[PDB]
């Protein structure tokens, strides 16, 4: 994975690629690495795929209950605290590497979490196997006082760096924009720069090509 | 190592060291081989200027190379032991790898090859 997060004027934007691997094999060409914890708190996750989804869902579930209990919109620091303490408890065995971002009554926020439970703060962050390609772009083009459209450009450019240069990353760019005072906008497949070219040939077989031994109707009714 | 080419060609195309080795053979006691319809007989002369010999222990003129092949010779006695030893070793080596004793032709071809090697190797006569 390549994942990034970038702060701007009135909020924060996160982005991710969409490749899923099992060794050298691409298992999923269009997987969703952007996770909703609450309506306006979103997570980008690298590492063990099932871990990032499970830990994001569990804390998301507990955040919802907490929001209902307190009659308050959830805060990013709460999701941050709950995620880090859960991950620390498991001493790195839950391989979730997360970029946590969002807006709440306190303002706009950007954090990252490492599988062992360390957190950090920044205006721009990147995680995953393509984080070095991404961070190179971020360190080259980031500046203070970015606009919304500048931050999206920077974030997706940083993801593209990973897509092209990291074998762990590929396919498409997903984006989520969290602006203060507005609804978070999830931009699924914001960029799709890896469309498969037309195949040279149709491999549709003449009907009857496959030898068959038996046929039978399967009963699915009661 | 001693390298000298001792067996070399002369202007007339002779290898004198090989030809002089034949003179040593001509000096040696007579040996004869006659093969019958179902046997071979090897006869050997023994000079009688040597009385007081012990014939029990004195090296015999006909040597067994294997249980089925024999070798007699004419010439330098000391030289023949080296050929006989090598032949006997090759006999056992052939039984070991081929799982069959040597043919008389093969054993002969080996002994002749050894003799030839000593005619174009440095440092040997």
């Amino acid at each position: 994975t390549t994942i990034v997060g970038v702060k701007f004027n009135n909020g924060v934007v996160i982005a991710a690629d969409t490749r899923s691997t099992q060794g050298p094999i691409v298992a999923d060409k269009n997987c969703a690495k952007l996770h909703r914890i609450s309506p306006k708190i979103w997570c980008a996750g690298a590492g063990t795929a099932a871990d990032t989804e499970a830990v994001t869902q569990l804390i998301g579930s507990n955040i919802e209950l907490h929001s209902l209990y307190t009659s308050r919109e959830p805060r990013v620091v709460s999701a941050l605290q709950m995620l880090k303490q859960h991950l620390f408890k498991y001493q790195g065995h839950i391989g979730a590497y997360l970029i946590v971002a969002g807006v709440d009554p306190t303002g706009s926020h950007l954090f990252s979490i490492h599988a062992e439970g360390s957190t950090d703060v920044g205006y721009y962050l990147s995680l995953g196997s393509g984080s070095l390609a991404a961070m190179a772009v971020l360190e080259s083009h980031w500046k203070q006082d970015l606009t919304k459209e500048e931050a999206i450009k920077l974030a997706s450019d940083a993801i593209q760096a990973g897509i092209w240069n990291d074998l762990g990353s590929g396919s498409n760019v997903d984006v989520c924009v969290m602006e203060i005072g507005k609804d978070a906008e999830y931009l699924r497949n914001y960029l799709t720069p890896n469309v498969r070219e037309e195949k040279q040939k149709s491999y549709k077989f003449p009907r009857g090509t496959t030898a068959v031994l038996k046929e039978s109707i399967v009963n699915i009714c009661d | 190592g001693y390298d000298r080419a001792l067996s070399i060609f002369s202007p007339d195309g002779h290898i004198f060291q090989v030809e002089y080795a034949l003179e040593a053979v001509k000096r040696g006691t007579c040996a004869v081989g006659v093969k019958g319809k179902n046997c071979v007989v090897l006869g050997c002369e023994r000079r009688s200027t040597l009385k007081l010999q012990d014939t029990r222990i004195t090296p015999s003129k006909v040597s067994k190379i294997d249980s089925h092949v024999v070798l007699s010779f004419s010439g330098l006695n000391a030289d023949s032991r080296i050929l006989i030893e090598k032949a006997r070793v090759e006999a056992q080596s052939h039984r070991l790898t081929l799982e069959d004793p040597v043919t008389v032709e093969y054993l002969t071809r080996y002994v002749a090859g050894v003799q030839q090697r000593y005619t174009q190797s440095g440092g040997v006569r």
């Binding site: 605290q81 950090d120 703060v121 205006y123 070095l132 390609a133 961070m135 772009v137 360190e139 | -």
Partner: protein, 233 residues
């Protein structure tokens, strides 16, 4: 079988329209100790080639001596040693590549990653990589160590394929190299601020720049960062 002791980090490089640029910092690391600061890791061979070396420094110094000897040996009984029979970048590379692979095959490698940058006699750009395994490859941009992960992505934005090379000037190329060096200083824990840079141009020849510094760095935003989550002061 070895282990590297005193080491040099990234060597970065790229092709532009008229030649090649190559750079490497001036540090000799001893594990985590940043031990030596006056280490030149770019070595010119003649006026048409620069060999950039990372990895074990004792082995780098050995390779220096080999190249130095190669120049001497080429001059022997050679009236055209400074003309048609001068050492080409391609000759220097193939020699090193041969040595590197032979040493790995004897299970006693020269613990290095090497980039040979130069211009051939016909004006063609030369840029090729070889390492301790004897692995060789060529690309419009080449980098070793952390440079492979951080510089290459940046340099590939300028020259992404062959057709981008004629469209890239020495000003644009050097700017990209110098920027990549800054990024490496931000992010590589065994990098130094001081570095050397070399340009081998088919018109202006070899330009060797020493004692360059990373500058125009962004650190001001650090003052705003407090804690690691919930801390406000």
């Amino acid at each position: 079988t070895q282990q590297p002791i005193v080491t040099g980090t990234s060597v970065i490089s790229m092709k532009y329209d008229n030649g090649v640029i190559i750079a490497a910092d001036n540090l000799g690391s001893y594990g985590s100790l940043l031990r030596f600061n006056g280490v030149e890791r770019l070595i010119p061979v003649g006026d048409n080639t620069v060999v950039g070396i990372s990895g074990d420094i004792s082995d780098m110094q050995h390779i220096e001596r080999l190249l130095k000897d190669l120049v001497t040996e080429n001059a022997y009984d050679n009236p055209l040693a400074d003309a048609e029979e001068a050492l080409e970048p391609s000759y220097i590379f193939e020699y090193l590549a041969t040595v590197m692979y032979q040493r790995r095959s004897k299970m006693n490698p020269l613990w290095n990653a090497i980039i040979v940058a130069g211009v051939q006699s016909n004006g063609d750009q030369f840029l090729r990589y070889v390492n301790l395994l004897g692995v060789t490859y060529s690309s419009p941009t080449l980098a070793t160590g952390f440079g492979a992960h951080m510089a290459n992505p940046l340099l590939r934005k300028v020259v992404d394929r062959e057709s981008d090379i004629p469209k890239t000037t020495v000003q644009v190329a050097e700017e990209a190299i110098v920027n990549a060096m800054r990024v490496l200083y931000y992010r590589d824990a065994r990098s130094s601020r001081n570095f050397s840079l070399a340009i081998i141009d088919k018109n202006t020849g070899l330009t060797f720049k020493k004692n360059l510094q990373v500058e125009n760095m962004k650190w001001d935003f650090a003052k705003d960062i407090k804690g690691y989550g919930t801390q406000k002061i």
